Design a protein around this ligand. Structure first.
Ligand code: SAH
Length: 198
Protein backbone atom coordinates (compact mmCIF):
# COMPACT_ATOMS: atom_id res chain seq x y z
CA UNK A 1 0.00 0.00 0.00
CA UNK A 2 3.04 2.36 0.43
CA UNK A 3 3.12 4.22 -2.86
CA UNK A 4 5.97 6.77 -2.38
CA UNK A 5 8.86 6.47 -4.83
CA UNK A 6 11.48 8.88 -3.68
CA UNK A 7 15.23 9.25 -4.36
CA UNK A 8 15.88 6.43 -1.86
CA UNK A 9 13.53 3.86 -3.35
CA UNK A 10 15.58 2.34 -6.18
CA UNK A 11 18.82 3.58 -4.65
CA UNK A 12 18.39 1.47 -1.54
CA UNK A 13 16.53 -1.54 -2.97
CA UNK A 14 18.85 -2.12 -5.97
CA UNK A 15 22.12 -0.48 -4.92
CA UNK A 16 21.89 2.17 -7.66
CA UNK A 17 23.59 5.54 -7.43
CA UNK A 18 21.07 7.98 -6.03
CA UNK A 19 18.83 9.76 -8.61
CA UNK A 20 20.78 12.53 -10.41
CA UNK A 21 20.31 15.83 -8.47
CA UNK A 22 19.37 17.66 -11.70
CA UNK A 23 16.67 15.12 -12.41
CA UNK A 24 15.27 15.62 -8.86
CA UNK A 25 15.30 19.42 -9.47
CA UNK A 26 13.81 19.13 -12.96
CA UNK A 27 10.74 17.22 -11.83
CA UNK A 28 9.75 20.21 -9.64
CA UNK A 29 8.85 22.02 -12.89
CA UNK A 30 8.56 19.34 -15.63
CA UNK A 31 5.09 17.64 -15.28
CA UNK A 32 4.77 13.83 -15.82
CA UNK A 33 4.65 13.05 -19.60
CA UNK A 34 6.39 11.18 -22.40
CA UNK A 35 10.10 10.90 -21.61
CA UNK A 36 13.30 9.88 -23.38
CA UNK A 37 16.48 8.97 -21.36
CA UNK A 38 19.48 8.85 -23.68
CA UNK A 39 22.20 6.61 -22.18
CA UNK A 40 20.00 5.47 -19.26
CA UNK A 41 22.69 3.26 -17.72
CA UNK A 42 21.44 1.09 -14.87
CA UNK A 43 18.24 3.14 -14.76
CA UNK A 44 18.49 5.37 -11.64
CA UNK A 45 16.73 8.22 -13.51
CA UNK A 46 14.48 6.20 -15.79
CA UNK A 47 13.11 4.04 -12.94
CA UNK A 48 12.57 7.12 -10.73
CA UNK A 49 10.67 8.85 -13.49
CA UNK A 50 8.61 5.76 -14.50
CA UNK A 51 7.71 5.21 -10.80
CA UNK A 52 6.47 8.84 -10.66
CA UNK A 53 4.12 8.79 -13.64
CA UNK A 54 6.36 9.62 -16.57
CA UNK A 55 6.26 7.23 -19.61
CA UNK A 56 9.92 6.52 -20.22
CA UNK A 57 12.00 5.25 -23.18
CA UNK A 58 15.28 4.16 -21.57
CA UNK A 59 18.13 3.56 -24.09
CA UNK A 60 21.74 2.57 -23.68
CA UNK A 61 24.49 0.63 -25.47
CA UNK A 62 25.43 -1.52 -22.42
CA UNK A 63 23.41 -4.76 -22.70
CA UNK A 64 24.19 -5.74 -19.09
CA UNK A 65 22.83 -2.36 -17.86
CA UNK A 66 19.65 -2.70 -19.94
CA UNK A 67 19.16 -6.29 -18.62
CA UNK A 68 19.41 -4.80 -15.13
CA UNK A 69 16.74 -2.15 -15.90
CA UNK A 70 14.54 -4.93 -17.37
CA UNK A 71 14.96 -7.08 -14.28
CA UNK A 72 14.02 -4.19 -11.91
CA UNK A 73 11.17 -3.21 -14.26
CA UNK A 74 9.71 -6.71 -13.92
CA UNK A 75 10.01 -6.84 -10.14
CA UNK A 76 8.40 -3.40 -9.80
CA UNK A 77 5.70 -3.76 -12.52
CA UNK A 78 6.77 -0.62 -14.33
CA UNK A 79 4.65 -1.12 -17.42
CA UNK A 80 5.42 2.50 -18.53
CA UNK A 81 9.16 1.90 -18.84
CA UNK A 82 10.52 0.63 -22.18
CA UNK A 83 14.15 -0.31 -22.73
CA UNK A 84 16.33 -0.69 -25.86
CA UNK A 85 19.97 -1.52 -26.44
CA UNK A 86 21.12 1.08 -28.98
CA UNK A 87 24.19 2.92 -30.23
CA UNK A 88 23.71 6.70 -29.99
CA UNK A 89 26.40 7.12 -32.66
CA UNK A 90 24.16 5.48 -35.25
CA UNK A 91 20.60 6.21 -34.21
CA UNK A 92 17.90 8.49 -35.38
CA UNK A 93 14.52 8.66 -33.61
CA UNK A 94 11.14 10.23 -34.42
CA UNK A 95 8.61 10.26 -31.56
CA UNK A 96 7.48 13.51 -29.81
CA UNK A 97 8.52 13.86 -26.16
CA UNK A 98 7.61 16.08 -23.23
CA UNK A 99 11.05 15.59 -21.67
CA UNK A 100 14.41 14.32 -23.02
CA UNK A 101 17.34 13.93 -20.71
CA UNK A 102 20.95 12.96 -21.28
CA UNK A 103 22.99 12.99 -18.06
CA UNK A 104 26.79 12.38 -18.17
CA UNK A 105 26.60 10.51 -21.50
CA UNK A 106 27.40 12.80 -24.44
CA UNK A 107 31.16 12.98 -23.74
CA UNK A 108 31.42 9.23 -24.56
CA UNK A 109 30.02 9.75 -28.08
CA UNK A 110 31.94 10.55 -31.27
CA UNK A 111 32.36 14.32 -31.89
CA UNK A 112 30.66 13.86 -35.28
CA UNK A 113 27.49 12.58 -33.63
CA UNK A 114 26.71 15.51 -31.43
CA UNK A 115 25.31 18.21 -33.78
CA UNK A 116 22.85 15.80 -35.41
CA UNK A 117 21.92 14.15 -32.09
CA UNK A 118 21.18 17.52 -30.43
CA UNK A 119 19.19 18.56 -33.53
CA UNK A 120 17.22 15.30 -33.26
CA UNK A 121 16.49 15.87 -29.55
CA UNK A 122 15.32 19.41 -30.22
CA UNK A 123 13.09 18.35 -33.16
CA UNK A 124 11.55 15.51 -31.04
CA UNK A 125 10.63 17.80 -28.15
CA UNK A 126 7.02 19.13 -27.95
CA UNK A 127 6.61 22.91 -27.73
CA UNK A 128 6.52 23.59 -24.00
CA UNK A 129 8.66 20.41 -23.43
CA UNK A 130 12.06 20.25 -21.84
CA UNK A 131 15.61 18.99 -22.42
CA UNK A 132 17.96 18.26 -19.51
CA UNK A 133 21.74 17.85 -20.47
CA UNK A 134 24.71 17.43 -18.23
CA UNK A 135 28.04 16.86 -20.05
CA UNK A 136 31.76 17.28 -19.79
CA UNK A 137 33.54 20.34 -21.17
CA UNK A 138 37.02 21.16 -22.41
CA UNK A 139 38.24 24.65 -21.54
CA UNK A 140 41.48 26.56 -21.10
CA UNK A 141 41.03 26.56 -17.32
CA UNK A 142 39.95 22.83 -17.18
CA UNK A 143 41.28 20.88 -20.14
CA UNK A 144 39.59 17.58 -20.80
CA UNK A 145 42.56 15.16 -20.91
CA UNK A 146 40.46 12.26 -19.71
CA UNK A 147 40.06 10.66 -23.20
CA UNK A 148 36.38 11.49 -23.77
CA UNK A 149 35.93 11.54 -27.62
CA UNK A 150 33.65 14.58 -27.17
CA UNK A 151 33.45 17.56 -24.82
CA UNK A 152 31.60 20.84 -25.06
CA UNK A 153 33.48 24.07 -25.61
CA UNK A 154 32.69 27.08 -23.36
CA UNK A 155 29.38 28.49 -24.53
CA UNK A 156 28.72 25.69 -26.99
CA UNK A 157 25.74 24.08 -25.33
CA UNK A 158 24.20 27.56 -24.74
CA UNK A 159 24.51 28.24 -28.44
CA UNK A 160 22.87 24.93 -29.38
CA UNK A 161 19.93 26.03 -27.17
CA UNK A 162 19.94 29.70 -28.10
CA UNK A 163 16.20 29.96 -28.75
CA UNK A 164 15.06 28.01 -25.70
CA UNK A 165 14.12 29.25 -22.23
CA UNK A 166 17.16 28.28 -20.12
CA UNK A 167 15.51 27.55 -16.82
CA UNK A 168 19.03 26.51 -15.67
CA UNK A 169 22.31 26.91 -17.56
CA UNK A 170 25.76 26.78 -16.09
CA UNK A 171 29.33 25.59 -16.76
CA UNK A 172 30.31 24.95 -13.14
CA UNK A 173 33.30 22.93 -12.08
CA UNK A 174 32.36 19.36 -11.04
CA UNK A 175 34.16 16.14 -10.26
CA UNK A 176 34.53 12.77 -11.89
CA UNK A 177 34.38 9.63 -9.82
CA UNK A 178 37.77 8.52 -11.16
CA UNK A 179 40.88 9.86 -9.54
CA UNK A 180 44.19 11.23 -10.76
CA UNK A 181 47.78 10.06 -10.11
CA UNK A 182 47.38 11.42 -6.49
CA UNK A 183 43.94 9.84 -5.81
CA UNK A 184 42.07 13.21 -6.06
CA UNK A 185 38.82 13.24 -8.00
CA UNK A 186 39.48 14.66 -11.49
CA UNK A 187 38.01 18.23 -11.89
CA UNK A 188 36.29 19.33 -15.11
CA UNK A 189 33.68 21.87 -16.03
CA UNK A 190 30.26 20.35 -16.95
CA UNK A 191 27.61 22.05 -19.02
CA UNK A 192 24.30 21.71 -17.11
CA UNK A 193 21.21 22.83 -18.72
CA UNK A 194 17.55 22.58 -18.14
CA UNK A 195 15.77 24.15 -21.17
CA UNK A 196 12.15 24.62 -22.21
CA UNK A 197 11.22 24.76 -25.88
CA UNK A 198 9.11 27.79 -26.94
N1 SAH B 1 27.50 5.08 -28.12
C1 SAH B 1 26.64 4.97 -27.09
N2 SAH B 1 25.29 4.73 -27.22
C2 SAH B 1 24.41 4.57 -26.20
N3 SAH B 1 24.76 4.71 -24.90
C3 SAH B 1 26.09 4.99 -24.68
C4 SAH B 1 27.08 5.18 -25.74
N4 SAH B 1 28.26 5.44 -25.16
C5 SAH B 1 28.05 5.43 -23.81
N5 SAH B 1 26.74 5.15 -23.54
C6 SAH B 1 26.14 5.05 -22.22
O1 SAH B 1 26.36 6.20 -21.47
C7 SAH B 1 26.16 5.89 -20.08
C8 SAH B 1 27.15 6.76 -19.32
S1 SAH B 1 26.92 6.65 -17.54
C9 SAH B 1 25.52 7.74 -17.22
C10 SAH B 1 24.25 6.90 -17.21
C11 SAH B 1 22.95 7.64 -16.79
N6 SAH B 1 22.61 8.73 -17.77
C12 SAH B 1 23.10 8.24 -15.40
O2 SAH B 1 22.95 9.47 -15.23
O3 SAH B 1 23.36 7.49 -14.43
C13 SAH B 1 26.40 4.34 -19.90
O4 SAH B 1 25.18 3.71 -19.58
C14 SAH B 1 26.88 4.03 -21.33
O5 SAH B 1 26.75 2.71 -21.74
Amino acid sequence: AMVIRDENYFTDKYELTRTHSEVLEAVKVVKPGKTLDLGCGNGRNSLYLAANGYDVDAWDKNAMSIANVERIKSIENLDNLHTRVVDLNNLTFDRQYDFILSTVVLMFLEAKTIPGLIANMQRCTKPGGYNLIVAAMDTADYPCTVGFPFAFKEGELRRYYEGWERVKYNEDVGELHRTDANGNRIKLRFATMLARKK
